[PDB]
mmCIF file of C-alpha atoms in Angstrom:
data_model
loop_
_atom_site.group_PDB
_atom_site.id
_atom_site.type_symbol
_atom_site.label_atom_id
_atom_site.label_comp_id
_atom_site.label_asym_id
_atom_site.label_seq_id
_atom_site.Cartn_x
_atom_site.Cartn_y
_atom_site.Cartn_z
ATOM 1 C CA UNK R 1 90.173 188.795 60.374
ATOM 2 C CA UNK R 2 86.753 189.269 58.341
ATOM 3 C CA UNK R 3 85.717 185.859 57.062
ATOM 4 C CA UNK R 4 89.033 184.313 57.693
ATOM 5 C CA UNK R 5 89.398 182.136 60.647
ATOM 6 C CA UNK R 6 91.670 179.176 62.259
ATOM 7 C CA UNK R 7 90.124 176.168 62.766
ATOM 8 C CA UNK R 8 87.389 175.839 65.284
ATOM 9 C CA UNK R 9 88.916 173.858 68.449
ATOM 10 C CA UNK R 10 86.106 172.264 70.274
ATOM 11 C CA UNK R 11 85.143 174.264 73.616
ATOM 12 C CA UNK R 12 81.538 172.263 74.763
ATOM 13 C CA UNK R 13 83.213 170.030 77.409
ATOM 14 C CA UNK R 14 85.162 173.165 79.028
ATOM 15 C CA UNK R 15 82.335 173.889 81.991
ATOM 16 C CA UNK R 16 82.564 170.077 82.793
ATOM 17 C CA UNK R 17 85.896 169.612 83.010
ATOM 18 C CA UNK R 18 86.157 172.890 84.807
ATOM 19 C CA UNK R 19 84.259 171.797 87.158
ATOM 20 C CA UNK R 20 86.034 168.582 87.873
ATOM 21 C CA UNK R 21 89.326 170.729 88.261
ATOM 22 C CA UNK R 22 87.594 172.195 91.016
ATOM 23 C CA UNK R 23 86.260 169.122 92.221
ATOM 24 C CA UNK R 24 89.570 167.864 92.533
ATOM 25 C CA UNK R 25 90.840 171.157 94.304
ATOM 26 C CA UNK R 26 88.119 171.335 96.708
ATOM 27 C CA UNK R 27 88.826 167.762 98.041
ATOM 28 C CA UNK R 28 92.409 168.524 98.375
ATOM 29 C CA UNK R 29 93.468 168.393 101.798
ATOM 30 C CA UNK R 30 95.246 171.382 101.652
ATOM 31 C CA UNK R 31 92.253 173.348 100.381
ATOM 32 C CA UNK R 32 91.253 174.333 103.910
ATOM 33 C CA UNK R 33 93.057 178.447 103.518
ATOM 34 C CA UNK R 34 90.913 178.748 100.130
ATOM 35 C CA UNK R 35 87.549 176.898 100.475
ATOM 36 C CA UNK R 36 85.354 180.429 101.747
ATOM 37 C CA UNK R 37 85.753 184.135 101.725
ATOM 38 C CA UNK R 38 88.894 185.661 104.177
ATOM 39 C CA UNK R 39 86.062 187.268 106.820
ATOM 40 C CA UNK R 40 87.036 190.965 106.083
ATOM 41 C CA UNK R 41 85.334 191.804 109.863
ATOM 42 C CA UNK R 42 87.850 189.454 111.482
ATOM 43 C CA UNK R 43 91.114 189.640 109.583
ATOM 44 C CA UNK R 44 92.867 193.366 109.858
ATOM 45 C CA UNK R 45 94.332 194.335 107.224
ATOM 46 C CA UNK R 46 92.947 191.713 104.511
ATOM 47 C CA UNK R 47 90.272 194.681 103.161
ATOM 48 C CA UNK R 48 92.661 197.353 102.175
ATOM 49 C CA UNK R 49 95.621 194.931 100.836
ATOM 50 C CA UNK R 50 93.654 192.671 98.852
ATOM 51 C CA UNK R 51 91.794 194.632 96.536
ATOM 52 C CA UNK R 52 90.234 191.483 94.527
ATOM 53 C CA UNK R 53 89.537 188.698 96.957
ATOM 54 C CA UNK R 54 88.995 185.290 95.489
ATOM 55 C CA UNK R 55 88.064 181.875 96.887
ATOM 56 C CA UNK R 56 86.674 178.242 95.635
ATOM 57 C CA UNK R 57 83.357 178.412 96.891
ATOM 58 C CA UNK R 58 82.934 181.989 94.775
ATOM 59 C CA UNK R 59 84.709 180.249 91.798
ATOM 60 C CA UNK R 60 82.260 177.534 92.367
ATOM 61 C CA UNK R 61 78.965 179.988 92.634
ATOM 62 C CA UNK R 62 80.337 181.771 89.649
ATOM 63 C CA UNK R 63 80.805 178.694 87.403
ATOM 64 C CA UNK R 64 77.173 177.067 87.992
ATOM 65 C CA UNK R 65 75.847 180.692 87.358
ATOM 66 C CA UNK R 66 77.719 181.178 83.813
ATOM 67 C CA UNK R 67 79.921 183.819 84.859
ATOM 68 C CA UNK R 68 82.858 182.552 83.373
ATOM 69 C CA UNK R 69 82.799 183.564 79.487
ATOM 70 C CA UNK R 70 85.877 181.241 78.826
ATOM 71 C CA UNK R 71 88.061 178.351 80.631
ATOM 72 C CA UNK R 72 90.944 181.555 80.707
ATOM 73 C CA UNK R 73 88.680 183.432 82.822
ATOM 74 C CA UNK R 74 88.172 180.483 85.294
ATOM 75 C CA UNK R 75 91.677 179.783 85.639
ATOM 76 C CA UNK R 76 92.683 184.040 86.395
ATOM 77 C CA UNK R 77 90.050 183.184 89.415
ATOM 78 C CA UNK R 78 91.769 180.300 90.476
ATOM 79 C CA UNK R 79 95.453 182.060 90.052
ATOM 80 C CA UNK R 80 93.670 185.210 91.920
ATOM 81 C CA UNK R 81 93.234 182.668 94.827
ATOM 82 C CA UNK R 82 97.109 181.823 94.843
ATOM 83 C CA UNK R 83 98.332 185.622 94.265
ATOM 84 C CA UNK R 84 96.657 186.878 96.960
ATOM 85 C CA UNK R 85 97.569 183.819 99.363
ATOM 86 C CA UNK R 86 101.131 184.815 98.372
ATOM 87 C CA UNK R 87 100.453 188.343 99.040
ATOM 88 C CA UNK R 88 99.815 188.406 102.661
ATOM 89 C CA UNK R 89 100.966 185.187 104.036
ATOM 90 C CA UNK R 90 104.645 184.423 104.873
ATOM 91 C CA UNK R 91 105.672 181.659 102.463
ATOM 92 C CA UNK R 92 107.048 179.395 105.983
ATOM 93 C CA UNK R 93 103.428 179.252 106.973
ATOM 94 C CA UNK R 94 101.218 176.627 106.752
ATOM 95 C CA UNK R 95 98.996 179.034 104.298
ATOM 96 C CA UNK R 96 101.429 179.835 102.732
ATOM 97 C CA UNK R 97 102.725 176.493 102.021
ATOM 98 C CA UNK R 98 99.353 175.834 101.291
ATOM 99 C CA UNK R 99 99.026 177.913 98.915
ATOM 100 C CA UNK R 100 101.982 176.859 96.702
ATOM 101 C CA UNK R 101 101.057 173.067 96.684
ATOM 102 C CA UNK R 102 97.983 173.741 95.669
ATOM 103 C CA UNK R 103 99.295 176.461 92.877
ATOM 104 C CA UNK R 104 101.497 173.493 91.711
ATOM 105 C CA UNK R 105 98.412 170.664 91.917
ATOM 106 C CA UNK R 106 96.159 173.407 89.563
ATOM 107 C CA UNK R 107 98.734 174.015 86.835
ATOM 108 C CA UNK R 108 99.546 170.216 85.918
ATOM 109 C CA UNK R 109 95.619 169.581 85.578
ATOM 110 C CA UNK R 110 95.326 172.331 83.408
ATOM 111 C CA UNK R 111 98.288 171.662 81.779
ATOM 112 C CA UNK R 112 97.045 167.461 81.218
ATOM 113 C CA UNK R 113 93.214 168.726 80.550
ATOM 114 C CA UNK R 114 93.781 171.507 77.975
ATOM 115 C CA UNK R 115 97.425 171.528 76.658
#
């Protein structure tokens, strides 16, 4: 409250490491679903369904641009990206597949860089 705070944990490296998360994700070879925007002019139905589409190179345009306030809003985009995969793929498809792997790959580096 007013004048009464918790210790101050140490946030400057956040955008760095960040970004080496989504190094790391980028590079993944089953990135391929997730690395540019669905093409709303080419894929019925993605428009209407997904009402908040998400991808890495938008995570990445956002991050060099300081659009992310916090490392919690970085990883909502990145968990966007997986929640909408989910949404309209089948999960026996290789997206959809995809998608999980790389859900799993995210969570333990955020897990090892920040817990």
């Amino acid at each position: 409250s007013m004048s009464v705070k918790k210790p101050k944990r140490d946030d400057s490296k956040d955008l760095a490491l960040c970004s080496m998360i989504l190094t790391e994700m980028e590079t993944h070879e089953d990135a391929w679903p997730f690395l540019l925007p669905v093409n709303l002019k080419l894929v019925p139905g993605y428009k209407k369904v997904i009402k908040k589409p998400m991808d890495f190179s938008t995570i990445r345009e956002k991050l060099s641009s300081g659009q992310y306030p916090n490392l919690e809003t970085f990883a909502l985009d990145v968990r966007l990206v997986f929640d909408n995969c989910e949404t309209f793929n089948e999960d026996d498809s290789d997206i959809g597949r995809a998608g999980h792997n790389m859900r799993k790959y995210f969570e333990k580096k955020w897990t090892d860089t920040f817990k």
